[PDB]
Design a protein around this nucleic acid. Structure first.
Lengths: 279, 235
DNA sequence: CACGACCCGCACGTACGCAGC
DNA sequence: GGCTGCGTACGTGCGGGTCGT
């Protein structure tokens, strides 16, 4: 039994030798600059190999540049098998951290069901990644971040842009501030619309909305409360004397940093169309 | 002590098994189809043998099929545009090519683009659009409503009412709907509005004969009413 | 910049089960 | 049944990692 034992030990040693061999050798065969290739875990090698394989299977620098956010590619199971280089600028994480394993692993729970039903052709939906950037940091000390995603399927492909948090703000556009149920508190307006902050101030913004859209607005509001930020569609909002105007809004939620307590609301409201139909 | 030991065994089990699931996924992802399931070493050898068989434009394609938009390098004179502008707004290199972009925006939306040319992001209108850049890219997103009060008094309408019955909003805006009800069932709608206020956020169809599906709306956060939505239509 | 605090990838040895000159 | 190669597992000690205080 001891001879079979010593030879088992030695033959198994041979096995592990060719194992580590084929692993770091698979790392050499990657599209990665070796400065990072053989330097990482072999399970990682598995991840990104699988990913890039189903990537090149499923198929100047001008373009990705002007874009805001990054590129996301999923399959029916959710193995997010591609991520564009630019990710680093957002989230804080890097491509290589997350190129080709679960999407639910990096998105906030109590949000996965959206993904689920949206793996069931045009799709505009907000997701809840985890930013680690504030400069880059470590996980669990990192926190939840939102991303507006516009995309289509074929094996899904998505554009994921970030939002402008009014902690870092910046003639077309006007800001606004409201309570939680949306009674105004702080405004700028008349030029493009009609009314005054003096005249409004404390008024439910749902009243000055169009009924045809207030459905979508309430849906994106339930979003707002349940999620973090939002970027709505195109409002047909009323004027003082006039009819409707095409309006866009990127609103935010104010959490009183004192125990992160839901306090106020602020909207960055874009305007598109001129006052249609005066009489 | 024992805790760290059995947690060690569990976690290493999970890691091993995830490396085996990675192994299977990879096993079927690669072409060598074989009779049934080779060992993991051979699977890996075939993986790298396959992987020895060896970009921006594919990324371009990706963005196109992700946004339905296009690219343009400008000054307001343009100097280049993406060809994919054609499956978007048509007019390829016609009112583009080397033209000023101003001669392509909505005649009213020129001075905003002027005020935004002292990162850079904005929203514009174009001849049959959200746009971002530093050069940039651009991509794309019988019955009538009636909003009332808690006691029936109107607040809002839809113009195609004038097609439906033939009336104009202002001579209805502010007035009462029970004043418009045939005396017979003036109570009915009343009862209806006696119910929608109690039927928290749920429909209610009544026959005034014009159908209408009245239901209350409570402020999504504070969940208290401020108006009743009543789609009314003819039959 | 430290030191034990711990967590983790990766060795490592050994086990159980298949086959067969 | 013996003993082998042969391969996939489970358990674990050890080096190098990172977080807290």
């Amino acid at each position: 039994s001891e001879r079979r034992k010593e030879k088992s030990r030695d033959a198994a040693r041979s096995r592990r030798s060719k194992e580590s061999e084929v692993f770091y050798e698979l790392a050499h065969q990657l599209p990665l600059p070796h400065n990072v290739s053989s330097h990482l875990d072999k399970a990682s090698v598995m991840r990104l190999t699988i990913s890039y394989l189903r990537v090149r299977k499923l198929l100047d620098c001008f373009y990705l540049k002007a874009l805001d956010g990054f590129v996301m590619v999923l399959t029916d199971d959710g193995d997010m098998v591609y991520i564009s280089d630019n990710v680093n600028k957002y989230m804080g994480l890097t491509q290589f951290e997350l190129t080709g394993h679960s999407v639910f692993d990096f998105t906030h729970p109590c949000d996965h069901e959206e993904m689920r039903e949206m793996l069931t052709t045009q799709r505009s939906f907000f997701l809840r990644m985890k930013c680690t950037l504030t400069r880059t940091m470590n996980i669990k000390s990192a926190t939840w971040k939102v991303l507006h995603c516009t995309g289509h399927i074929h094996c899904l492909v998505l554009i994921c842009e970030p939002i402008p948090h009014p902690s870092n703000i910046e003639s077309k556009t006007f800001l606004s501030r409201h309570s939680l149920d949306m009674k105004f508190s702080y405004c700028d307006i008349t030029e493009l619309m009609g009314y005054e902050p003096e005249e409004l101030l404390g008024r439910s913004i749902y009243e000055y909305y169009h009924a045809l859209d207030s459905d979508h607005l309430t849906k994106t509001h339930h979003d707002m409360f349940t999620k973090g930020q939002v970027t709505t569609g195109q409002y047909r909002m009323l004027a003082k004397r006039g009819g409707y105007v095409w309006v866009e809004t990127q609103a935010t939620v104010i959490y009183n940093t004192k125990n992160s307590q839901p306090q106020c609301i602020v909207c960055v409201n874009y305007v598109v169309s001129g006052i249609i139909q005066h009489d | 002590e024992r805790l760290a030991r059995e947690n060690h065994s569990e976690i290493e089990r999970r890691r091993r098994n995830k490396m085996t699931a990675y192994i299977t996924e990879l096993s079927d992802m690669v072409p060598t189809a074989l009779a049934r399931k080779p060992d993991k070493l051979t699977i890996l050898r075939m993986a790298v043998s396959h992987m020895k068989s060896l970009t921006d434009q594919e990324l371009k394609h990706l963005i196109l099929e992700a946004a339905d938009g296009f690219l343009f390098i400008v000054s307001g004179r343009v100097v280049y545009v993406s060809d994919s502008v054609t499956p978007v707004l048509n007019q390829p290199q016609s009112e583009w090519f080397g033209s000023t972009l101003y001669d392509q925006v909505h005649p009213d939306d020129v001075d905003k683009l002027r005020e935004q040319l002292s990162r850079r992001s904005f929203i514009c209108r174009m001849r049959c659009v959200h746009c971002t850049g530093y050069v940039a890219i651009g991509r794309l997103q019988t019955e009538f409503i009636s909003r009332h009060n808690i006691e029936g008094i109107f607040t809002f309408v839809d113009h195609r009412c004038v097609a439906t019955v033939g009336y104009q909003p202002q001579e209805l805006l502010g007035k009462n709907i029970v004043e418009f009800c045939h005396p017979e069932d003036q109570q009915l709608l009343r009862d209806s509005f006696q119910q929608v206020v109690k039927l928290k956020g749920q429909v209610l169809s009544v026959m005034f004969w014009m159908r209408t599906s009245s239901f209350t709306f409570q402020n999504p956060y504070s969940d208290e009413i401020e108006y009743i939505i009543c789609t009314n239509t003819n039959v």
